Design an enzyme around this catalytic site. Structure first.
Site, PDB file in Angstrom:
ATOM      1  N   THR A  55      -3.235  -2.930  -5.771  1.00  0.00           N
ATOM      2  CA  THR A  55      -2.888  -3.917  -5.208  1.00  0.00           C
ATOM      3  C   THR A  55      -2.146  -3.822  -3.878  1.00  0.00           C
ATOM      4  OG1 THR A  55      -0.970  -3.476  -6.241  1.00  0.00           O
ATOM      5  CG2 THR A  55      -2.947  -5.712  -7.268  1.00  0.00           C
ATOM      6  N   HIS A 102       5.276   3.065  -9.912  1.00  0.00           N
ATOM      7  CA  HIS A 102       5.971   2.249  -9.194  1.00  0.00           C
ATOM      8  C   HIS A 102       6.313   0.991  -9.380  1.00  0.00           C
ATOM      9  CE1 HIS A 102       2.140   1.690  -8.379  1.00  0.00           C
ATOM     10  NE2 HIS A 102       1.898   0.489  -8.192  1.00  0.00           N
ATOM     11  N   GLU A 134       3.862  -9.422  -8.315  1.00  0.00           N
ATOM     12  CA  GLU A 134       2.262  -9.208  -8.020  1.00  0.00           C
ATOM     13  C   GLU A 134       1.255 -10.686  -9.177  1.00  0.00           C
ATOM     14  OE1 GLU A 134       1.241  -5.204  -7.361  1.00  0.00           O
ATOM     15  OE2 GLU A 134       1.441  -6.001  -5.132  1.00  0.00           O
ATOM     16  N   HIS A 146       4.559  -0.712 -12.419  1.00  0.00           N
ATOM     17  CA  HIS A 146       2.968  -0.200 -12.639  1.00  0.00           C
ATOM     18  C   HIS A 146       3.151   1.046 -13.121  1.00  0.00           C
ATOM     19  CE1 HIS A 146       1.425  -3.758  -9.598  1.00  0.00           C
ATOM     20  NE2 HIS A 146       1.834  -4.110 -10.537  1.00  0.00           N
ATOM     21  N   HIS A 175       6.993  -2.677  -7.480  1.00  0.00           N
ATOM     22  CA  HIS A 175       6.918  -3.924  -6.264  1.00  0.00           C
ATOM     23  C   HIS A 175       8.249  -4.975  -6.627  1.00  0.00           C
ATOM     24  CE1 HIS A 175       3.372  -2.876  -5.860  1.00  0.00           C
ATOM     25  NE2 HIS A 175       2.899  -2.256  -6.922  1.00  0.00           N
TER      26      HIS A 175
HETATM   27  C1  LIG Z   1      -3.852   5.157  -4.915  1.00  0.00           C
HETATM   28  N1  LIG Z   1      -3.526   5.423  -6.035  1.00  0.00           N
HETATM   29  C2  LIG Z   1      -2.423   6.568  -6.193  1.00  0.00           C
HETATM   30  C3  LIG Z   1      -3.782   4.322  -7.150  1.00  0.00           C
HETATM   31  C4  LIG Z   1      -4.111   3.876  -7.978  1.00  0.00           C
HETATM   32  C5  LIG Z   1      -3.950   2.759  -9.212  1.00  0.00           C
HETATM   33  C6  LIG Z   1      -3.432   2.143  -8.684  1.00  0.00           C
HETATM   34  C7  LIG Z   1      -2.560   1.712  -7.702  1.00  0.00           C
HETATM   35  C8  LIG Z   1      -1.584   0.387  -6.749  1.00  0.00           C
HETATM   36  S1  LIG Z   1      -1.481  -0.664  -7.339  1.00  0.00           S
HETATM   37  N2  LIG Z   1      -0.531  -1.538  -7.134  1.00  0.00           N
HETATM   38  O1  LIG Z   1      -2.848  -1.145  -7.849  1.00  0.00           O
HETATM   39  O2  LIG Z   1      -0.914  -0.103  -9.179  1.00  0.00           O
HETATM   40  C9  LIG Z   1      -0.831   1.043  -6.014  1.00  0.00           C
HETATM   41  C10 LIG Z   1      -0.858   2.262  -5.269  1.00  0.00           C
HETATM   42  C11 LIG Z   1      -1.654   3.343  -5.329  1.00  0.00           C
HETATM   43  C12 LIG Z   1      -2.665   3.200  -6.547  1.00  0.00           C
HETATM   44 ZN   LIG Z   2       1.518  -1.748  -8.051  1.00  0.00          ZN
END
Ligand SMILES: CN(C)c1cccc2c(S(N)(=O)=O)cccc12
Ligand SMILES: [Zn+2]
Ligand SMILES: [Hg+2]
Length: 255
Positions: A194, A90, A102, A115, A92
């Protein structure tokens, strides 16, 4: 929770106390205090057998999901022990090109941040992984505004079909290798998710080299909505969390 004035990052601690924990992400990467660690192995990214399945708008960002039932797209090497399976990726981004990332580099903010989420296979499934200090590994890639990234166009074109919260679309045969920069040089540190639940189970690997995307490509990101269909339109912009205190952590560089 969300990214607004009344439900943004500054309010998260009320529902998720860990928001004020010891290894929270993201953080500012001070390039001068980062320790070059010669024992860090190069990153091994095996994305040739990747199988993308669906793209979905979850109300905070859009995710591209992959079939993680077998070692199809895996990450290993670097500071990692064992194999980590790609489950989803995904972004940001900001409302303006000067914000969106971020993690920052010497306080520098990029237009967006990608990410690629992976979970440690020794734990059986992602749900068990989020209960371990080494259950997840997230590959972070900075995006800067310039030339168009050809490999991002297929994602950019499908955005129209998942404009609102809850919408999803079949998104097969997407190759994430097209989103990787030329160099795999990186910074790494122990952190967390995050976004709530903000669990501290992540080994962050932030690539030094950013990828370029065009102004047109980034603009389409900004046309998505936080709200569901039929509700007043809230443009999905600035879905990023501010840098957290490094605390008792050292950022290591592979270079
Ligand atoms: C819950 N599951 C799907 C996840 C695992 C690891 C990181 C995640 C992130 S982030 N922004 O930390 O990469 C954002 C949303 C979900 C995440
Ligand atoms: Zn993320
Ligand atoms: Hg954890």
């Amino acid at each position: 929770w969300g990214y607004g004035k009344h439900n943004g990052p500054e309010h998260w601690h009320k529902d998720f106390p860990i928001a004020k924990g010891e290894r929270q992400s993201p953080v500012d990467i001070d390039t001068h205090t980062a320790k070059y660690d010669p024992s860090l192995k190069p990153l091994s990214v095996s994305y040739d057998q990747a199988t993308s399945l669906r793209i979905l708008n979850n109300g905070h960002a859009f995710n591209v999901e992959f079939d993680d039932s077998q070692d199809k797209a895996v990450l290993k090497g670097g500071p990692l022990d064992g194999t980590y399976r790609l489950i989803q990726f995904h972004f940001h981004w900001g409302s303006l090109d000067g914000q969106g990332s971020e993690h920052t580099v010497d306080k520098k903010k990029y237009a967006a941040e990608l990410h690629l989420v992976h979970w440690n296979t020794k734990y059986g499934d992602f749900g068990k992984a989020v209960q371990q200090p080494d259950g997840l590994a997230v590959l972070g890639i900075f995006l800067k505004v310039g030339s168009a990234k050809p490999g991002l166009q297929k994602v950019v074109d499908v955005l129209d079909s998942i404009k609102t919260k809850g919408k999803s679309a079949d998104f097969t045969n997407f190759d994430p290798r097209g989103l990787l920069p030329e160099s795999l040089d990186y910074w790494t540190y122990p952190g967390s998710l995050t976004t709530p639940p903000l669990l501290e189970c992540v080994t962050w690997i932030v690539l030094k080299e950013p990828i370029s995307v065009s102004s047109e490509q980034v603009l389409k990101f900004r046309k998505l909505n936080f709200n569901g269909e039929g509700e007043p339109e809230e443009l999905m912009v600035d879905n990023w969390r501010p840098a957290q205190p490094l605390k008792n952590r050292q950022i290591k560089a592979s270079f």
